[PDB]
Each structure stands twice: as C-alpha cells, then as structure tokens.
UniProtKB/Swiss-Prot annotation:
Cofactor(s) required, per the database record: pyridoxal 5'-phosphate
Entry annotated with the keyword rRNA processing: no
Pfam families referenced in this protein's UniProt entry, alphabetically: PALP (PF00291)
PANTHER family reported in the protein's UniProt record: CYSTATHIONINE BETA-SYNTHASE
Family annotation (InterPro entries): Cys_Synth/Cystath_Beta-Synth (IPR050214), P-phosphate_BS (IPR001216), TrpB-like_PALP (IPR001926), TrpB-like_PALP_sf (IPR036052)
Protein name (record): Protein CysO
In-chain residues carrying the UniProt-annotated modification N6-(pyridoxal phosphate)lysine: A126
Amino acid sequence: ALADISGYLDVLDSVRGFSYLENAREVLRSGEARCLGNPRSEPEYVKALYVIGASRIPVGDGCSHTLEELGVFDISVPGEMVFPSPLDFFERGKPTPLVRSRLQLPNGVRVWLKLEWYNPFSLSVADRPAVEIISRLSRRVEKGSLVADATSSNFGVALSAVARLYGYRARVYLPGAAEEFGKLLPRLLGAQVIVDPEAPSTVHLLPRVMKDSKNEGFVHVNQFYNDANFEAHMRGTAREIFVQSRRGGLALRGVAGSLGTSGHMSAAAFYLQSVDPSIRAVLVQPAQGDSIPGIRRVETGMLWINMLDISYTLAEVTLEEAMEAVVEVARSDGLVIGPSGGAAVKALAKKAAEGDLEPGDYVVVVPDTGFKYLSLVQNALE
Ligand SMILES: Cc1ncc(COP(=O)(O)O)c(CN[C@@H](COP(=O)(O)O)C(=O)O)c1O
C-alpha cells in the first residue's frame, strides 16, 4: 500500500551517516522497494526513499512497489508554468532544462547541457542546497536567527534569498577574488556581507566563520560538510538526470561536471552508478595555478566525492581552456554558460578526444550563466 512520505520527514533530522545509502543503491538497482510493516521502525529505509526522490512510501506486509509507484517519476511542473509563490516555483518548477548541444565531439560522444541557471534565486545550481539546508533547519532554529556561510558567490546569494523567505537573517563571507555579483546581490537581498581580501580561496575562510560562530552564536550552515547539500542534489539534480535520460530516450553513458563542495557531482555519480555502474563521471580538475570561479581541485578537501563509493575520472583544464569552451558553446548553441560550465564541457571533450569514452549520450551539468562573468568574457575575447 502507499502512504505520503511527507508524514515521515523527521527521519531527515534523526538518521545520521551514509549507511542508509545502501538501501538507496539497491532500490535504484532493482527498480523497486519492499513494503515496510512498521515504517517508523525503519528510518534508514525511509530516508533512502526520500533521498532518491520518492514522494510515497510502501507500507504493508510482503508487497513491493516500483519507483514509478513511489513517485520517483512523478511530473511536478504545472504545464502552464503558473506558481503561487517563489518557493513553490523553486520546488515544482523542475527539472531544469536538459538541452542537446550542436557541438560535435570526437568518437560518437553526444553532448547534452543541463542548465542549472534555471533556478530562480541565484541563477545557479547552489539554490538547491540552500533550499534544502534552510528548510531542514526551519524545524529547530528560531525565526529571526542569523545563518551564515563561506561561499565563492553563488551559494551566498541563494542562502540570502532563501533565508529571508523562511524568516532568518543571513551573513555571507567571501574571499577578495569573488565576483562582484556575490559581494553585492546578498546585500540587495538584505544579508550582511563580509569580504576578506586576504583569503585566497573560500575554504581559507572556514576558520574565521567558525570562530565568529562561537563568539556570536550564529548558525554556520557549512555547505562543505552539511549532508543536506548532497541530499538536495540526489533528490533534485541527479534524479532529474535519471528521469530525463529515460523519458528523453537518451543512451546515457556518462555525466560531466565540476567540484566545489562536490555536492552535485557526487550525487549525480552516486545516483546514476546505482542504476548502472558503468556510467562514467568525468570531473574537472582546475590546472594548478588557475582559478576557475566556483570550483577547486580535489585534494583541497571534499566530503562526498571522497567518502562515497563513486567511480570517476579527472581531467585537468586551465582557465583559458574553460573560457575557450564558453566561447565555442556560445557560437555553436547561442547559450552563454559560466566558466565552470565551460570547464566541464572541456573536460568531456578531452576524454572524448583520447578515445576513453563509449559513444552515446553524455550530460554536462552547467552550474550557472556566463552573463555573470563579463570581465572573464572580455579577457577570453582578448
Ligand atoms: C559557479 C559554480 N560552479 C560550480 C560549483 C560546484 O558545485 P559544488 O558545491 O560541487 O556542488 C559551484 C558551487 N559554489 C559554492 C562553492 O564554492 P567552493 O569553491 O568553496 O566550493 C559557492 O559557494 O557558491 C559554483 O558556484
């Protein structure tokens, strides 16, 4: 029998650790889930169903239910794109678009771009962990409280918009090299902004954010370490790639993407590899010395990509190459993607050129829109 999962969402605040992900993997592998006689007594199984995108739980004795029955494949978007409020727009206005590029890659690699700027608050993939993180906290943190984090730009914008929509104040910390939209748009959205010209990277800033958190008592939502980030992408980004691949008729052979906190690409690789373990994940390594906004090198400390049972391949990409790929996609598709999106197209093209990849459909997650990076666009034009 089926029950509405929204009833059982306290397992989100009681289950800890990654061991529940075994259940998520097996349900996705087998395409079905066993009924729970006492759902309240299996909180790991319930969390696993939420995390893969079920809206209903299987309840009863000996029965089982398919992904489709559990609502993994439910259509959420009203055909007419009308929404009673901004958060309902964020929630129901999904999947984000998956668009075949006209770009031709060597060796039968067909390229599809998943456009994460179609998120309403930061015009970036960072809306999704902001919403899930503030939502989970809205259960236990009193309204009016301050929330804060370190960001490269995007997550701090999404944080400021989302915290305000739920009744919280926000503070964002940024390094001096961050884009101007990152330092300015949070103030527009009513958040306090702290810029460190000394900080060379966003993780550099984490000790200061932690220290100020002890002194002032604000909630440090810590997108680097908060599992709600990874879980937002499992039930959003990754489940969409799966559902979009199936209903789209793609022969999905891999996904490509870039790593900041590593939340969205871990989710993508973990989720799809549960369904089919030969699916590649090609991941961008910014070249040592180079700064590509929003992203960073693996060895510098990433939670999910490291701890989860995920296969991936790295590719080194310089900022110059990322920008040449922004240029090619624009001229080829008329879409203007951000530097980290060009970096992932470039990483996929490298692997294609080397003969490493099966022919088929590859999805590239494009984190944001190039319109936000005019100085780098001007440099690339040269
Ligand atoms: C523009 C851009 N491109 C890629 C990413 C990577 O997503 P992840 O968190 O792996 O999921 C982001 C994410 N931006 C964060 C993190 O900045 P860091 O370099 O310290 O991870 C942000 O603060 O906005 C992004 O913005």
